[PDB]
Amino acid sequence: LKFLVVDDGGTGRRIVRNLLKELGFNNVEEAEDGVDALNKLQAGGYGFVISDWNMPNMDGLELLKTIRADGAMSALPVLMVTAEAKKENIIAAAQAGASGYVVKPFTAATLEEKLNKIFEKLGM
């Protein structure tokens, strides 16, 4: 399953890249903003998207909205990473169609769980 990790911060991508590797997922690509992510997703082949919220050029919510509006990309599982205490962001993400969310900072256990929920939910 090919994952696309989107985050404008290198540390954030490295944290997610290592946790996935630990969980056994070695097919992981990275993008630094919503535009960079869409350029890659349009190329095809992806099976899961993990996206940061605040990013320049195109943020995570706009990215999610774009994915969901696109016929070829609309069915992609999208896990949004929201900041601690930004309750409105979780609500806006759910309304926009996020498959789930995870609040940063998160542990490896929390991340595995959120992933497990989506897999079960979408039946993967």
User: Annotated binding residues, as ranges?
Assistant: 7-8, 52, 54
Instruction: State how far the Cα of 72 lies from the Cα of 62, in Å rounded to an integer.
Output: 17
Q: Does 33 bind Mg ion (CB under 5 A)?
A: no
Which strand (E) or helix (H) includes residue 50?
strand 48-51
Which residue number, 30 or 52, has a Cβ lying nearer to Mg ion? 52
Which segment (32-40, 45-53, 94-102, 116-124) binds Mg ion by CB under 5 A? 45-53
Task: Give the one residue of 52, 67, 81, 98 binding Mg ion; rule: CB under 5 A.
Answer: 52
Q: Where does residue 80 fall: left (phi above 0), alpha (psi -120 to 50 degrees), or beta otherwise?
A: beta
Binding to Mg ion in span 75-104, by CB under 5 A: none
Binding to Mg ion (CB under 5 A) within 3-32 occurs at 8
Of the candidate spans 31-39, 48-56, 76-84, 103-111, the one that interacts with Mg ion by CB under 5 A turns out to be 48-56
Return the number of the residue (58 or 119) whose C-beta is nearest Mg ion: 58
Smallest separation, CB 83 to Mg ion (Å): 9
Which residues have C-beta within 8 Å of that of residue 6, sequence separation ≥ 6? 30, 31, 32, 33, 34, 36, 37, 49, 50, 51, 52, 55, 60, 63
Size of the site for Mg ion (CB under 5 A): 4
Cα separation, 93 vs 79, whole angstroms? 9
